[PDB]
Structure formats: C-alpha cells, structure tokens
Ligand binder design. Sequence first.
Ligand SMILES: [Cl-]
Ligand SMILES: [Cl-]
Lengths: 263, 265
Amino acid sequence: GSEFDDWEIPDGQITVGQRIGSGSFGTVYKGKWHGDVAVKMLNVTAPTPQQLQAFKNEVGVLRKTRHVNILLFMGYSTKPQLAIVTQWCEGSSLYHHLHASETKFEMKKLIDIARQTARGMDYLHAKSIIHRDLKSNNIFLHEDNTVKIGDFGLATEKSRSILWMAPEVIRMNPYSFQSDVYAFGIVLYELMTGQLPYSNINNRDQIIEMVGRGSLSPDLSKVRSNCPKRMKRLMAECLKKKRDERPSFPRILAEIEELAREL
Amino acid sequence: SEFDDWEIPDGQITVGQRIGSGSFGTVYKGKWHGDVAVKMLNVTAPTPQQLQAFKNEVGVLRKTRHVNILLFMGYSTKPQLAIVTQWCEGSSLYHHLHASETKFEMKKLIDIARQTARGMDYLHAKSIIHRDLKSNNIFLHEDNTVKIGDFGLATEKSGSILWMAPEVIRMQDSNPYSFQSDVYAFGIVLYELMTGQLPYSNINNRDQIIEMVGRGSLSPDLSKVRSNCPKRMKRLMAECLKKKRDERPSFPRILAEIEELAREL
Ligand SMILES: [Cl-]
Ligand SMILES: [Cl-]
C-alpha cells in the first residue's frame, strides 16, 4: 500500500561520499544513510512532468523486483538531483576482483558466483526483464558473500562494453533474453579463464566486426584445467553465434546447480 | 616466535579490498577491531636478519606521532610482512583531484595545504626525510584531517617523478634526497591543489620530462593556477619549486606563511 512519494529518502538523511564511477544512466557514489548505501546520481538536470512520471514508473518496477541475487532498491533522493539508492556491496565488483585486483578465486568459489549470477538472471527473466548490460562490472559482491546483480533498472527507458555484446548486437532492437544469455557466457569466460576475451587484440574495430560477422570468438583454451567439463560445455552454448541456439536461464541455472552438486 | 605485543597474529586481521601500490608494498582495506589500512610488504622469505631490521623500523614508527600523519597501529609477519594504520575513508588527495575531479573550495584546498605542511614540519623537526611525498600518499580522514603516509621504512629506502626535485631526478642513483627535495615535492602538491592538475600533463614522454626537469629547463607552468589562488600561496609555491635547493624555504617557514595567508580569509 505504499506509494511513490513514500520511497523518497528525506533530504539530509544521506551523506554522499566517495565517487565510485559511471553506471547506466548516471554516476555511482558511496554513501551513508543509517548504514552504507550506494547512490547513483542520474544525469537529468530539470525533469519534465513526463520524465518525472517515467522515473516514477521505473521506480515502481524496482520496488517489486526482489531476489537475494539482485541489488535491493532502498529509495530515491531528490536533492540536488534524482538518484537511485541501493545497498552497498563491500566486496565491490566481480570485474574489480578479476581484472584489477587479480584476486584468486578457487574453482568452488567461481562456480558459486556463476550459480548466484544465474539465479539472479533467471529471476529477472522470469519477470520478463531484459538486462541489456550484464558484465562483471555490475555483478557485485556483498560483504556477506552473496552476489548482487545491478544495472538492471530503467529497462524501458533503455529501449528508447563490447566484450559482452552478442554478435547480433555488436553489428546492429537487437537486445533479447538470448543476448543476456551471451553476456552471461562471457562472464563465465571471465570466471573460468581469469581474463577478458580477446586480450591479444589491441584494436576495438578489429574485434567489433570479426565478432559481429562471426570470425572471432573467445579462446576457450584459456579456461583453467580444473574447470568442470559441463561448465565448459555450458559456456560454449551461451556463446553460440546463432542466438536461437542459446539455452535459456531456467536451463542454465539447472545445469550449474547440478554441476555444483558434483563437488 | 618470541612474543611481540605490537604484532598482530595470523588470524586477527581480515584483508578486504585491494586498493593499490604504495612504496614498498600493496595497500588493502581491512578489519582489525574496525576498519584499518594494511600494507603488504614486498619481502618474500624474510630472514631473521631482515625481520630484526624490520622490528627496528617498527620501533621508529611507533615514536613518530602527529595528528597529520598516519598512526602505526601494528604489524604482522604471518601470513605476510604487513604494516597496519588507520583507514582514511576520504581516500587520497590524488584520487580526488585527478580521478574523481572532486571540486574543492579554495578554503578547503588551503586547509589541506596547511595540514600537510604541519605534518611535514613535524617529520622534519624529527630529522625525518619523507623521500616520496605526493598526492598519492596524502590521505583525507573521515573527520576531514589530513594524514600523511608512506614516510616509514626510511632507513630501508616510476610515476613518482612528477614530484622529484631536479637534483633528485638527475642523480637518482646517488641518494639525492634531502629536506629540501621534500620541500620541492610539497611545492608540486601545492601546484596540484592550486591548479587542479598534474604538472606537465601536456607532454607524452616521461623520458623528456626527466631530462628537461633534470637540466632545469622544464618546470611547472604556474599560469595554470586558478584565478582565486591567493598571491601569497602562488609565491610560496614558486619558492618551494626553486631549482637551487638551498634557496627553497624550510617547513617551519612554509607552515607559518600558510597559517597567516589562511587567516587573511
Ligand atoms: Cl513508484
Ligand atoms: Cl527497501
């Protein structure tokens, strides 16, 4: 029975702190409410009655999409600008661990992260939400070791980073549940290899079309030796160039769940 | 082995976010009865000989205390050689200036300069040469106090060249460091505060910078200072940046001068 007005965090209750970086539609800062929060300042200066109502509509979606493996929407703030407030993940991002700290995860941990990410993506798809922007950069590690997917919000506003782009997207509308599945395949690649795909190609433009046409795909030889065979097989499916040949997330999760029992 | 009441045992620190490289090791956020910073030292298999050398640095670190330098709170040996200090939630001056492009007010900038000079004044009164002062190891605490770090392991003592005095950059293999080369480093820091940038940002070749800064023929372009940088601060900056090192002012005078010019506001 709550309404949009009630999800505003009263002015002054959030102290905004260290700037973290850019996310979809805005800038992410660390903050303090009663506890740690993340605050994403939206890039909108003076919102028209139509843009405010759209913000209301998206917020309405965020309020009802809830799962242990996606960020919790905690409210929005109005001054100085519209902002989305969420819980803070002390473990930062998967990207930061894999590619910036070069943190060493053991195989069991890699697989647990893949499993939690698949659970999260499965829930979003079950709610008919297309993420469009899945990458290790917006997969977060909570202090309690849970995976929290982020950047799934403002989906409709979206329908108005090339490494995770399915070829049909990378050459072109083109976004689908199946393109989400591909980006997840790249995240599996990141996890199972410890590196970004195409690390041997220095020019984007070479990558953009070769992957687009289909003459370039991730080098699977870079996969760790203790990576389960099933996991390798699943990754290859999610990365199918023909989008209709990719598995869906109920299937992906089932495959990772069972594959995880064997351990 | 052999009890040391300042050592933190192998189980008691939780290492968290990797932050980055500081002198002589890697910095981590961590937990020891609360947030701390943990710097893991680049020593692999420490002999009991370097361990005693380290224990001696630790003795000096304990005694070096001032509101404007990091507090040495403990060390570890297992699983790795590490120094623990307080955590500064405000991160470094470098991160704000050149990564976040945080926009500080002139008053705040001058307060940071004032607090950093106080820290450097204390060190120099204890006859300590920092040797590596730069915006990267000037930290802002949650409570707004400036905390200087990276001054430890002085007896034990890249992108750091921007802060290197000309006599330092050209005699790098000859222990060129002095109280006066610290003062220059501080002048580069004033430069960053007053212009919002790294000096020589328009030049691509580090080697060109080393050579030119070494010959005295390249120096920070002081015209790039904000329009409202006080005249006294711009002059101080230029004195700290003198190529003749004995012509640079000492920190008691640098401090006094900043105190007053800040009062005029
Ligand atoms: Cl709403
Ligand atoms: Cl909530």
